[PDB]
Amino acid sequence: MQSQAISNYENKVEKLDTSKADEMRAAAEVYNQTLEKGVVPNYRLSEEEKRTYNSLLDVTGTGIMAYVEIPKLGTNLPIYHGTDDAILQVAIGHIPGSSLPVGGQGTHSVISGHRGLPSAKLFTDIDKLKNGDRFMIHVLGKTITYQVDQTLTVEPEDISSLAIDPDQDYCTLVTATPYGINSHRLLVRGHRVPNEK
């Protein structure tokens, strides 16, 4: 299911000319440059903003923009647009209003399984990631590597650590961590490092 989705993504990417892939990825980077930085993120999009967001990195019909690879956890998951409310029950979703997952200075992308059904087990083992561990975003044939440097457990309202820092390139993985009689969020942040040749 998740394997099939990723195969379908890879097939579409292969069919694309490098020119087109580069054009699509540059459009995402240009969009990221317009986002506000150094502030608590605003994750409430207008209708016009949603239309813009949905039109970007629309590789497959289903709205898969990329996939994440976490070698240590044996995890490979397709990343959907975060407006696709139904599919987020069984798949990872990018948080709209955060940077699209194409990297660059002054980007902080956020991808989450917090809306996933328990049986879906989305990012169920990201609590096992330690500082120094790597994950990779695969987007339109480009590999982008992140090294985890921070693991926070927060109340769902506290998103201040998801701010876009103008001089950094961060990706945060998010999941629901239900302990006690309440629900919390686990935020696993990595910073951009060079790829493994």
From TrEMBL:
Active site: 114, 176
Entry keywords, A to Z: Hydrolase, Membrane, Metal-binding, Transmembrane, Transmembrane helix, Zinc
Presence of keyword DNA damage: no
An annotated Gene Ontology molecular function: metal ion binding
Residues that bear Pros-methylhistidine: 184
Amino acids binding Zn(2+): 184
UniProt name for this protein: Sortase-like protein, putative
Lineage of source species: Bacteria, Bacillati, Bacillota, Bacilli, Lactobacillales
Shown residues in whole-protein numbering: 35 to 230 of 295
